Amino acid sequence: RPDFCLEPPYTGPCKARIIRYFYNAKAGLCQTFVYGGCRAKRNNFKSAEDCMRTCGGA
């Protein structure tokens, strides 16, 4: 599992309401969060599947 899967989800400075997924390592689940629309970090996926294939495990 890439280390970026352990970082908190980052909304960013923009003010849109775009629903994205991020890997929640504390619960070991891919969950949704509100992404602002700019300056996305790596623990930010367009779908649960991407999130799972990427951070799902090791």
Binding site: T11, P13, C14, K15, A16, R17, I18, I19, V34, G36, G37, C38, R39
Partner: protein, 222 residues
Amino acid sequence: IVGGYECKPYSQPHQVSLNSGYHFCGGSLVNENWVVSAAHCYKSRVEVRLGEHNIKVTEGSEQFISSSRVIRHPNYSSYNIDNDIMLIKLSKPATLNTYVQPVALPTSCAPAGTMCTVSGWGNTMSSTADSNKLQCLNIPILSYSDCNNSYPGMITNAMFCAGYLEGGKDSCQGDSGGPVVCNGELQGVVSWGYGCAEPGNPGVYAKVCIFNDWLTSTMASY
């Protein structure tokens, strides 16, 4: 919208909701065929919802028009959040009426101190303020000095700050693309800021008046 108040239904007739499965951004109807929003709210195809007040309840007043074109400002930069403006062409022209009426473009750029209104269905950061019901908020345009001091080196000519350095009232996630109307003219488009309603971090808006030329030329190019 944090620290604002529920708008009188239909008091912001130009206010639109960008939908793509759910409300993700706001926008402003500038004419029966065009809507202005933020470039960071871009999507190749979006549905524009006009005549709305409570986005989660069918009111009879609404019009769902799909876009036919979505043009981002050519010089937009996502990292700098610079030139954060875009135009959306409505597939079928909006029917102007008691609920759907356009907002005028700025003739001049508004001065610091100018009191404006911003509205949207974004986060209200309150369990009492319902974001589904259009929220309104009066905010003064801040001087470039205070703006640049809040965000050192981040403020370009395409931006201006508006709000309160004390915090408490601001636009928030879900408000992007929305309007900042100062005396009947569309002065800005909700763009970004650090957090929402935080002291020392006022909201930053795209500066519409420095775009009049692109706006008009583009709405004429087919």
